[PDB]
Amino acid sequence: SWEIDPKDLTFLKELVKYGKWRGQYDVAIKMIKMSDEEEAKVMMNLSHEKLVQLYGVCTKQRPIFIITEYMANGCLLNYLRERFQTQQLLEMCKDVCEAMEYLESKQFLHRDLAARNCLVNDQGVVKVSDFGLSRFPVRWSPPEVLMFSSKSDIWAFGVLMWEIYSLGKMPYERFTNSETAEHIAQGLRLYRPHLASEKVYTIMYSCWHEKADERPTFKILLSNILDVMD
Amino acid sequence: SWEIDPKDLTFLKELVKYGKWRGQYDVAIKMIKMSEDEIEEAKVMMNLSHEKLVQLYGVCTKQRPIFIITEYMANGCLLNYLREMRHRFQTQQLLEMCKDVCEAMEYLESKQFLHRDLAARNCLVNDQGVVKVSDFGLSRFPVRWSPPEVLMSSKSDIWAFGVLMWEIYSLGKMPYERFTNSETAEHIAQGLRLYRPHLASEKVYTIMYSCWHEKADERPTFKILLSNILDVMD
Numbered sequence: 001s002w003e004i005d006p007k008d009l010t011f012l013k014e015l016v017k018y019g020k021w022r023g024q025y026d027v028a029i030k031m032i033k034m035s036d037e038e039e040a041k042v043m044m045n046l047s048h049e050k051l052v053q054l055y056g057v058c059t060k061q062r063p064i065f066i067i068t069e070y071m072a073n074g075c076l077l078n079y080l081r082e083r084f085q086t087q088q089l090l091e092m093c094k095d096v097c098e099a100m101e102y103l104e105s106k107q108f109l110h111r112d113l114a115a116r117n118c119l120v121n122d123q124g125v126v127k128v129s130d131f132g133l134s135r136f137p138v139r140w141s142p143p144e145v146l147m148f149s150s151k152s153d154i155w156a157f158g159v160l161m162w163e164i165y166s167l168g169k170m171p172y173e174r175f176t177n178s179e180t181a182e183h184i185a186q187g188l189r190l191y192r193p194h195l196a197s198e199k200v201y202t203i204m205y206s207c208w209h210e211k212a213d214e215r216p217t218f219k220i221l222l223s224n225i226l227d228v229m230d
Numbered sequence: 231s232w233e234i235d236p237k238d239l240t241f242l243k244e245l246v247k248y249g250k251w252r253g254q255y256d257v258a259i260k261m262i263k264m265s266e267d268e269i270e271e272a273k274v275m276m277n278l279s280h281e282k283l284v285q286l287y288g289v290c291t292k293q294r295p296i297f298i299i300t301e302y303m304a305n306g307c308l309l310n311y312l313r314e315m316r317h318r319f320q321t322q323q324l325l326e327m328c329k330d331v332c333e334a335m336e337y338l339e340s341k342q343f344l345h346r347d348l349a350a351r352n353c354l355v356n357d358q359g360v361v362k363v364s365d366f367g368l369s370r371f372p373v374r375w376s377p378p379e380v381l382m383s384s385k386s387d388i389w390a391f392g393v394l395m396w397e398i399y400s401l402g403k404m405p406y407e408r409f410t411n412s413e414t415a416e417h418i419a420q421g422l423r424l425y426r427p428h429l430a431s432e433k434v435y436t437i438m439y440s441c442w443h444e445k446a447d448e449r450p451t452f453k454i455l456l457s458n459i460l461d462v463m464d
């Protein structure tokens with residue numbers, strides 16, 4: 001049903017690679033080395049405009065391919081660093097939050113939610129991947145992780161907001177992974193970037209309660225982001 | 231690019247028709263009787279993109295008449311699905327139906343599109359139960375779904391969306407069924423509104439009732455409705 005014929009795949013350049021599907025369509029394609037490891041039955045059921053769209057797979061012979069939409073602006077971390085306005089930055093945030101809200105509603109977790117692992121289409125729209133979901137990247141991890149539930153993605157998302165409004169800085173750049181994890185436990189948090197209003201920082205900051213059961217749901221972050229957008 | 235060769239389409243039964251595209255896929259097929267100049271719509275369907283919009287698959291333009299192919303939404307239009315399934319829902323599910331539509335409509339509002347007839351008859355429901363709206367026939371007087379300023383922009387749809395909430399939570403009841411259209415207009419001009427259905431909580435109905443300010447500019451945007459709704463869902 002989703003089985004693509006590699007006859008129909010023309011390969012174009014490493015970046016995971018740019019390719020064409022049936023000669024027409026712009027696609028990105030990935031080639032497994034990892035083992036058997038059931039993921040894609042998640043990708044095949046999940047369905048949201050802010051997730052990287054699955055086009056198909058090549059399993060009927062070896063090695064394996066996954067084909068997705070070509071997000072022509074690449075990864076967000078670079079896109080930030082490569083012109084913006086604070087409303088655009090707030091949409092970028094909205095986009096990720098929608099995806100994550102959807103994922104949250106279906107009891108899934110991202111587990112490495114950062115700007116390098118976000119992705120940007122030709123229309124500037126930011127999407128997240130549904131491949132590799134769960135059901136220790138130090139600077140995106142909450143206290144309870146540095147010593148698997150909804151609220152660690154929330155922490156990660158708070159930092160992603162910081163990442164965005166920073167135009168892509170190394171978060172806590174001053175410190176090592178060790179000092180960062182120490183300092184995080186002291187109560188140190190990320191300082192309000194220049195480009196975020198007080199209203200914005202409040203969203204990102206609400207993600208960083210030392211207690212996971214005080215942090216908002218994506219549900220509420222999205223609600224909070226809608227609110228500011230006017 | 232979106233051109234579908236009608237070789238590859240089957241025409242199984244009316245419902246707009248159900249068919250099979252390329253033999254594999256379920257589809258819906260709309261055949262026009264309107265013009266064959268007013269295609270200019272379809273570029274809008276082609277540029278919009280959102281899960282809560284009935285997804286466009288393609289068209290049959292090269293030859294006559296015209297066809298619009300969309301995804302099959304196996305549970306049909308919403309009004310009938312409320313009534314068929316009246317005893318099967320739970321109040322959390324009714325609110326998701328609201329969320330679904332509010333999402334579509336927020337996207338559309340964020341792109342300056344108006345629906346025109348936002349109402350439970352014109353929404354559709356897939357095998358999953360998810361609710362969607364058509365982006366065909368947008369713009370840039372169904373009496374019961376219309377605000378005061380229509381009966382004599384963005385907030386028009388808002389009013390209609392309130393009645394939509396009332397519809398869902400009412401399990402498909404005719405809004406203002408006591409009254410005729412002429413009556414209904416007076417009572418809306420009097421400030422009478424739609425009462426709170428059994429199944430709607432205070433928070434829910436507050437949200438639906440916020441769509442019906444006499445003053446359009448005092449009505450919320452779909453941004454705030456979705457926020458409101460997301461806010462309630464916890």
Ligand SMILES: *CCC(=O)Nc1cccc(-c2n[nH]c(NCc3c(F)cccc3Cl)n2)c1
Pocket residue numbers: 015016028029030052066067068069070071072073074075078119129130131
């Ligand atoms: C950061 C380097 C970079 O910009 N890479 C890049 C550039 C353009 C396009 C992509 C891209 N487009 N689609 C994908 N998909 C990745 C992917 C998944 F996330 C999940 C499954 C399969 C794939 Cl191919 N990357 C990347």
Ligand SMILES: *CCC(=O)Nc1cccc(-c2n[nH]c(NCc3c(F)cccc3Cl)n2)c1
Pocket residue numbers: 245246247257258259260284298299300301302303304305306307310354363364365366
């Ligand atoms: C209202 C009666 C009913 O139940 N109709 C019904 C039943 C099942 C499926 C559909 C359906 N599925 N897709 C569509 N698409 C409608 C459509 C648009 F909204 C816009 C352009 C083209 C089409 Cl076909 N209807 C309806």
